[PDB]
Each structure stands twice: as structure tokens, then as C-alpha cells.
Design an enzyme around this catalytic site. Structure first.
Site, short mmCIF file in Angstrom:
data_model
loop_
_atom_site.label_atom_id
_atom_site.label_comp_id
_atom_site.label_asym_id
_atom_site.label_seq_id
_atom_site.Cartn_x
_atom_site.Cartn_y
_atom_site.Cartn_z
CB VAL A 57 33.95 8.11 5.89
CG1 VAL A 57 33.66 6.82 5.13
CG2 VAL A 57 35.05 8.87 5.17
CE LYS A 64 27.96 5.15 -3.23
NZ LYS A 64 26.66 4.53 -3.47
CB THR A 93 32.34 20.01 -19.97
OG1 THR A 93 31.38 20.77 -19.32
CG2 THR A 93 33.58 19.85 -19.12
CB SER A 172 54.30 26.27 -15.91
OG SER A 172 53.48 26.62 -17.01
CG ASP A 184 48.25 34.40 -16.44
OD1 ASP A 184 48.04 35.61 -16.33
OD2 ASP A 184 47.63 33.43 -15.77
CG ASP A 248 43.60 34.89 -19.55
OD1 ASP A 248 42.84 34.64 -20.51
OD2 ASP A 248 43.52 34.33 -18.33
NA NA Z 1 34.69 24.29 -21.00
NA NA Z 2 32.50 9.15 10.53
#
Ligand code: NA
Ligand code: NA
Length: 327
Positions: A57, A64, A93, A172, A184, A248
Site C-alpha cells: 500500500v 485514493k 472484449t 459446476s 467441459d 470443449d
Molecule cells: Na473476449
Molecule cells: Na506499506
DNA sequence: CATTAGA
DNA sequence: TCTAATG
């Protein structure tokens, strides 16, 4: 877990940004360890200074923290969240095949939208092309109900081609999950293990099986041991077709299944936790094997596994049904 | 953390 | 070859 909430998520927000919209690997790695330590700390942070006493830190994050503390916000945070280019990157993305590198590149090009990407499907690679296509179905969850039907078919052809195959549908799903994000399929064969110099076809056989029947409909990537794709359940007697499902399949030396089986099955915690245990119980667990510990500091020599049970017996634990492998 | 594309 | 993207 909550006393330190705000500071963690804020930090992470801070962190993910540097990483994606900027190329700030470090700043980003910076925010994460902090985000990390500050998370462990058992008390309410009441001030930067307070925080600052921490490891990783620094002056920069502390500052901040006060700002966030003082006022329920952060400008830098508010500015980015606003930032269109920036916004841009985070979005692009989601396109499977799109990563930060491209995200930026695309942006610099003026391709900011979904539509943008269409207009220029040329600028896109097949991965991204697919991705582009099944954007909606890619983001959509997979009802176990489907997991069930999917798993069925898959097992079926697996068997059909060769009856010596062993497939397991890990994740899962395996762990009871009401819904999953992609299936999977772990795969092995006797005729494949550690040394037995492959048999690429082992993989190949099945992929092709699956396609031959229309379960596989796209190839995102096919390698001699790891196939990556898209699928779909036979849209019934009309009026309702099935959404495009990421899938996959992977090959594996039959001599490494159960570990890998165990492992991919999670949860992340259950794993870490059993794993932690195997350490005391004088063992070593990792995605492929299980080695006995030698006092010298370390040791090798992979113990023989024939089932999820063996690994259990080994570390002398309670066989945990995958149901309750939650942690 | 390893595997695949691609350029 | 390296570099990106997935998991
Ligand atoms: Na992506
Ligand atoms: Na520190």
C-alpha cells in the site's frame, strides 16, 4: 469480506482498468496485491494512513482510499466509467476471441460497436467471426435441463465410436449446478497415457463423430489434445431452436484422469482445501497427479489412481460426492 | 499454465 | 518465432 468491501472492488475496478484500457501491467498488478491485502485486514479501514501501513500500500493508493472514504466515490473512477473509448474496450472484449490487444486495436480503427464489427467482419479472424455470430447465445447461460440432454448425446457417440472411451462432463454441472456457462468434456482412453506417444486420432475420432451428427457445428480450435468449439441441441419439432453452445473436449492419458477429473470438478475452494490437506497428509496434488512428500523439503513419485476414491483414500479423507464438493 | 492460431 | 486468447 464486507468490512473492507468498497476498498476492494474500487481497487479492482482501478486495477482491471490499467490492465485493459491501458497497458499498465504493473499499476495493474499494483492495484491487485493491495486489493488483496486490504481484503485480509480484519478491521475497518478508517483512513489511508491506516491502510498505508499495509504492504503494497503506497502513497498512491492511500490517497485514493481517503477520497473514497471521505466521499462515497472517486473521480478517476467516475471519469473512466464515463470514458467512451475506455467503455469501448470493455465491451469489445465480450466478443469471444477478442482480447485487450484487439480491443484497443479495434478501437483505434473506429470499430467500437457490435455493428462496427459486422461491417468489418473481414478485419475479424474465424475465432472472432464465430464469436461475432453467436454473441447472444454465447453470453446466455446453460440450463442443466440442457446439460442433461447435451451430456446424454455426447456420451452416446463417444460410446458409439469406441466403447473403450471414458468421458466425463466436469465443472459446476458435475457439481449439481442449476445452470452452467459451457460444457467441459474431460476425455481419456486406455490406449493413451503419460508415455504412449499419443494417438491424435483418439481426439479426432470423436470430434468428427459429434459433427457427423450435427452436435458440433463449429470449430473454434482443434488441436491434437484439445478441441474447442460450439454446439447445439436438435431443435425439436419446430417453433423452438436451441442456442449456440460453447463446448470443449480434451484428451488425456488414462493414467492421469481422476486427478484431472477431480480438479476440473472444483469448486476452486474445495480443491484448494483438499489440496491444502494432502500437504499435511504428506502429499502433493496437482491437476495431473499426486505425489508423496519427502521430508528433504520436496519429493516426487506419482501414486497410482483408478478413481476419485484413490485420491481420497490416499489423503485419508471422506469421499465427497461431487454434489457437496462446493468447498 | 498449457494449448492453439496466426502472421 | 512470438504474441494473443481461452480456460
Ligand atoms: Na473476449
Ligand atoms: Na506499506
Amino acid at each position: 469480506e464486507t468490512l473492507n468491501g468498497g476498498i476492494t472492488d474500487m481497487l479492482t475496478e482501478l486495477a482491471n482498468f490499467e490492465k485493459n484500457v491501458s497497458q499498465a501491467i504493473h499499476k495493474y498488478n499494483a492495484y491487485r496485491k493491495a486489493a488483496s491485502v486490504i481484503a485480509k485486514y480484519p478491521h475497518k479501514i478508517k483512513s489511508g494512513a491506516e491502510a498505508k501501513k499495509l504492504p503494497g500500500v503506497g502513497t498512491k493508493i492511500a490517497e485514493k482510499i481517503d477520497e473514497f472514504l471521505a466521499t462515497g466515490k472517486l473521480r478517476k473512477l467516475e471519469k473512466i466509467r464515463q470514458d467512451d473509448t475506455s467503455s469501448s474496450i470493455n465491451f469489445l472484449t465480450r466478443v469471444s476471441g477478442i482480447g485487450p490487444s484487439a480491443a484497443r486495436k479495434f478501437v483505434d480503427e473506429g470499430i467500437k460497436t457490435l455493428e462496427d464489427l459486422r461491417k468489418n467482419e473481414d478485419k475479424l479472424n474465424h475465432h472472432q467471426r464465430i464469436g461475432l455470430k453467436y454473441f447472444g447465445d454465447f453470453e446466455k447461460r446453460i440450463p442443466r435441463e440442457e446439460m442433461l440432454q447435451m451430456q446424454d448425446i455426447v456420451l452416446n457417440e463417444v460410446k458409439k465410436v469406441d466403447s473403450e472411451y471414458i468421458a466425463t462432463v466436469c465443472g459446476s454441472f458435475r457439481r449439481g449446478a442449476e445452470s452452467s456457462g459451457d460444457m467441459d468434456v474431460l476425455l481419456t482412453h486406455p490406449s493413451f497415457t503419460s508415455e504412449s506417444t499419443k494417438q491424435p486420432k483418439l481426439l479426432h475420432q470423436v470430434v468428427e463423430q459429434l459433427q457427423k451428427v450435427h452436435f458440433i457445428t463449429d470449430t473454434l480450435s482443434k488441436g491434437e489434445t484439445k478441441f474447442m468449439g460450439v454446439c447445439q441441441l436438435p431443435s425439436k419439432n419446430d417453433e423452438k431452436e436451441y442456442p449456440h453452445r460453447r463446448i470443449d473436449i480434451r484428451l488425456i492419458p488414462k493414467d492421469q484422469y481422476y486427478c484431472g477429473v477431480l480438479y476440473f470438478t472444483g469448486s476452486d475452494i474445495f480443491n484448494k482445501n483438499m489440496r491444502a490437506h494432502a500437504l499435511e497428509k504428506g502429499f502433493t496434488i496437482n491437476e495431473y497427479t499426486i505425489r508423496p512428500l519427502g521430508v528433504t523439503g520436496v519429493a516426487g513419485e506419482p501414486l497410482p489412481v483408478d478413481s476419485e476414491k484413490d485420491i481420497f483414500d490416499y489423503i485419508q479423507w471422506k469421499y465427497r460426492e461431487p454434489k457437496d464438493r462446493s468447498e
